[PDB]
A paper describes a structure:
In black-grass, upregulation of a phi (F)-class GST1 (AmGSTF1) has been shown to be a functional biomarker of MHR. Recombinant AmGSTF1 has been shown to exhibit both glutathione-S-transferase activity toward xenobiotics, as well as acting as a GPOX, reducing fatty-acid hydroperoxides to less reactive monohydroxy derivatives. The Phi (F) class GSTs, of which AmGSTF1 is an example, are found in all higher plants, being homodimeric enzymes in which each protomer of approximately 23–30 kDa with the catalytic serine residues located at the interface. Each protomer has two distinct domains; the N-terminal domain adopts the typical thioredoxin-fold, with the C-terminal domain being a bundle of at least five helices as demonstrated by the crystal structures of AmGSTF1 presented here.
Numbering used by the authors:
A (entry chain AAA), B (entry chain AAA): 2 to 216
The structure:
Amino acid sequence: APVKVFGPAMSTNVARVTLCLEEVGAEYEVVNIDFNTMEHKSPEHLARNPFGQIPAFQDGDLLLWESRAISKYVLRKYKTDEVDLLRESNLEEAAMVDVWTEVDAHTYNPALSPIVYQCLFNPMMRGLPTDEKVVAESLEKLKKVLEVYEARLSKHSYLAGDFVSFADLNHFPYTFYFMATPHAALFDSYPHVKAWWDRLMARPAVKKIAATMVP
Amino acid sequence: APVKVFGPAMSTNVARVTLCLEEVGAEYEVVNIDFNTMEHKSPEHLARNPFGQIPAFQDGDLLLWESRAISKYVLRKYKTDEVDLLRESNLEEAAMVDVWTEVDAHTYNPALSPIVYQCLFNPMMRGLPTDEKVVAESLEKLKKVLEVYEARLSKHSYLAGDFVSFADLNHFPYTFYFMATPHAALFDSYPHVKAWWDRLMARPAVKKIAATMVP
Ligand SMILES: N[C@@H](CCC(=O)N[C@@H](CSc1ccc([N+](=O)[O-])c2nonc12)C(=O)NCC(=O)O)C(=O)O
Ligand SMILES: N[C@@H](CCC(=O)N[C@@H](CSc1ccc([N+](=O)[O-])c2nonc12)C(=O)NCC(=O)O)C(=O)O
């Protein structure tokens, strides 16, 4: 049976989930939620996610929220020998996937996301202006974060090691929107980060979700 | 052999790791890192954590950072039948542990932590004053977050279900410092959240780490 993803397909946190689904070949459906109509706060959505945020996820009777929890459920349930993006079979490998999934959430996203938010999601979505001081500050922070990624990705093809993993998939959605800002060329200053990004953009599952991240 | 935790024992993110270690009965050592001397940026610390933050962790040749990644490595490595705080044996249970570990990081900590930071870690640690507007705003947010916890914890003894888990352990460290602020009595307005907190405070492993979270 279809598992179901609740939110607009464009949403970065929906795309984390839908990318994990494509990468394991799961049958799924995307049920839109209309921010313009406050559906994410409707009682039917609070049933799914009592904090009233997208995405939510339904597998039969199971209702999940927080894109990363959802994601790990998809990767565990549909795990084949050919697709172990969590490396739970290997304690040290599962540890490196964990470290870099935490780095995405606590170090990299907090430096990148406000540039996406200020340069893109504020003018284009909301209509509110671009805070050039939030941008200059996040950009300086992101330069320093990409110095450590550059080091990591000149030793290993992927963040976890020499295998694509959940760690890498975590970075795709917000970075894809970063690449539609005026600051996209920043990655060109980090040739190994760039090469890693192009390898990710070349994966069939990423090209398919990239396709869904338009209005 | 000792595994090693790098940071001051007081640190909330050190305590997440040290609590997971006590809860599985692992032999470990805490190697101090002196913020007053910038040791967290020393070259010896950047070897452990290239972003120059505590905690770091060493198991033999393995070097880990991000307290939650560390934590899951400890819980997987020292997993007994009697201590499965990740519930990886059960896909739905492992999913609920994930959801509420994400909620701690993305919903609960961002509303609680600035009250700890403003009321406690700024005057007592740093010497900078308390932003009463950050406090009033985080408190209103935290009230709404605790309404959803109150609902959850009137159906299940713990956030994951009727079993203590990593989800619950995640909430201990910052909440322990919240309980040393003037706003500690806030939990008394959420009788099930409170009862859950007292059950956590009664666990031998939590009393032992509580003991380490003083100057
Ligand atoms: N840690 C969570 C984060 C979930 C999250 O931040 N979701 C946002 C998604 S924000 C969003 C807001 C607004 C619009 N819009 O169309 O104007 C969006 N379109 O797509 N996503 C949109 C949300 O639902 N916020 C609403 C709220 O907190 O009240 C996760 O990874 O799932
Ligand atoms: N997501 C990470 C978060 C790690 C973290 O925020 N660590 C802080 C810990 S902050 C801290 C800062 C200052 C003092 N002090 O003694 O004045 C501390 N004592 O204990 N912890 C202290 C840090 O090292 N920051 C330094 C930096 O970013 O430059 C995780 O869970 O491990």
